[PDB]
Design an enzyme around this catalytic site. Structure first.
Site, PDB file in Angstrom:
ATOM      1  N   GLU A 149      57.605  26.819  32.174  1.00 53.37           N
ATOM      2  CA  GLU A 149      56.467  27.619  32.602  1.00 53.37           C
ATOM      3  C   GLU A 149      55.186  26.797  32.673  1.00 53.37           C
ATOM      4  OE1 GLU A 149      55.916  31.618  31.436  1.00 53.37           O
ATOM      5  OE2 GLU A 149      57.791  32.023  32.501  1.00 53.37           O
TER       6      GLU A 149
ATOM      7  N   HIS B  70      54.048  31.116  36.348  1.00 54.76           N
ATOM      8  CA  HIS B  70      54.169  32.525  36.702  1.00 54.76           C
ATOM      9  C   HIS B  70      52.882  33.099  37.279  1.00 54.76           C
ATOM     10  CE1 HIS B  70      52.327  34.076  32.764  1.00 54.76           C
ATOM     11  NE2 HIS B  70      51.770  34.819  33.702  1.00 54.76           N
TER      12      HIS B  70
ATOM     13  N   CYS C 138      47.133  34.264  30.473  1.00 55.94           N
ATOM     14  CA  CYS C 138      47.981  33.101  30.686  1.00 55.94           C
ATOM     15  C   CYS C 138      47.301  32.119  31.631  1.00 55.94           C
ATOM     16  CB  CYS C 138      49.336  33.525  31.250  1.00 55.94           C
ATOM     17  SG  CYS C 138      50.238  34.687  30.197  1.00 55.94           S
TER      18      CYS C 138
END
Lengths: 138, 161
Positions: free
Chosen positions: B51, B31, B128
Site C-alpha cells: 500500500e 488506495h 491515509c
C-alpha cells in the site's frame, strides 16, 4: 516565525483564500466569495468593502483559539502577509505597512499578521498587489 | 511538534493525502490514488510495494521544498509522529510507538505495513496518505505513510519501503 497552528487557519475559499479568527469567525476578501457545509442563509455575511466577515451559528474550527483581529496596524508595523499557494507552498512576506504595505493571481483573502507581546494580531486580508501590497480593513 | 515547511509537504491526493519527500519524490497510499499534479500518468514513474506508492516525476514540481531522508520504517520502539491533516484545515500530530511488521484485514482488504500504536482523538480513512516522521538529531526523517487503522483500536499501519 509563524507556528503551524496559525498557518492551518488559512483555508482556500472560492477563488482564493480566507482565514479563521475563531472556531466561528472567518474572514476573506469579497472578490473570492463565489459554505463549509452550512447553508448560505444560516450565516452572517457583513461585507465591509473588499473585506468580509462570516460568522457561523456553530463552531467549525474548534481546534483554533480566539485571536485578536484589529482594524489595521500602527504605521511602521512590520506585518507578515501569509500567502498560501495551490501547490501547498507557504509564502511569508514581510510587509512594512496599516492599510498599504511595502514588501521587503488568486492570493486575495490571505491574512496580515503582526506579533505584539506573546499574542498574534490579525489586521486584514490581501486585496490586490502589482512591490506594492494592499490590506483590506474591518 | 514539527515546523511549517514539513507540514506544507502534506497535500491532498484523491481520497486522502500525500507527501512531497523531495521536489520530485511524492509518497502516498496506493488506495487513495484517484481514478497527477498536471502530469500524464504515463510520464510519472510509479512504484508500489504493498500500500506504499512512490511517484518520481520527470520535472521538479515542488521547488519550494528540499530533499529529506526517507527510510524503510523505524526500529521497534521508535516513537514517530503521524502528521495528520484534516480537510477542515486542522492539524493533528499524533505520537505512535512503532512496532513490528504485520498483516491484517480491514474493510475487506488485506493490508501490510509497519504496525504502530497511537499514544495518549483518532484516525479516519480520509487521513491515509499522511506521513510518519521522527527527528534524528537535526534531520527530519520520513518512515512511511498512513494506510489503515483498526476498527476500534489505536493500532495503525504505516506503509513502508
Amino acid at each position: 516565525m509563524a507556528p503551524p497552528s496559525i498557518w492551518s487557519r488559512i483555508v482556500n475559499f472560492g477563488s482564493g483564500w480566507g482565514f479563521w479568527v475563531s472556531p466561528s469567525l472567518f474572514i476573506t476578501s469579497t472578490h473570492v466569495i463565489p459554505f463549509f457545509g452550512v447553508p448560505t442563509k444560516q450565516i452572517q455575511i457583513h461585507k465591509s468593502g473588499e473585506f468580509c466577515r462570516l460568522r457561523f451559528p456553530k463552531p467549525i474550527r474548534t481546534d483554533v483559539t480566539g485571536m485578536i483581529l484589529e482594524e489595521g496596524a500602527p504605521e511602521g508595523t512590520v506585518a507578515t502577509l501569509l500567502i498560501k499557494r495551490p501547490t501547498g507552498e507557504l509564502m511569508p512576506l514581510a510587509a512594512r505597512m496599516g492599510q498599504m504595505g511595502m514588501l521587503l493571481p488568486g492570493d486575495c483573502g490571505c491574512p496580515y499578521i503582526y506579533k505584539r507581546g506573546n499574542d498574534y494580531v490579525v489586521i486584514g486580508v490581501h486585496t490586490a498587489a502589482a512591490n506594492t501590497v494592499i490590506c483590506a480593513t474591518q
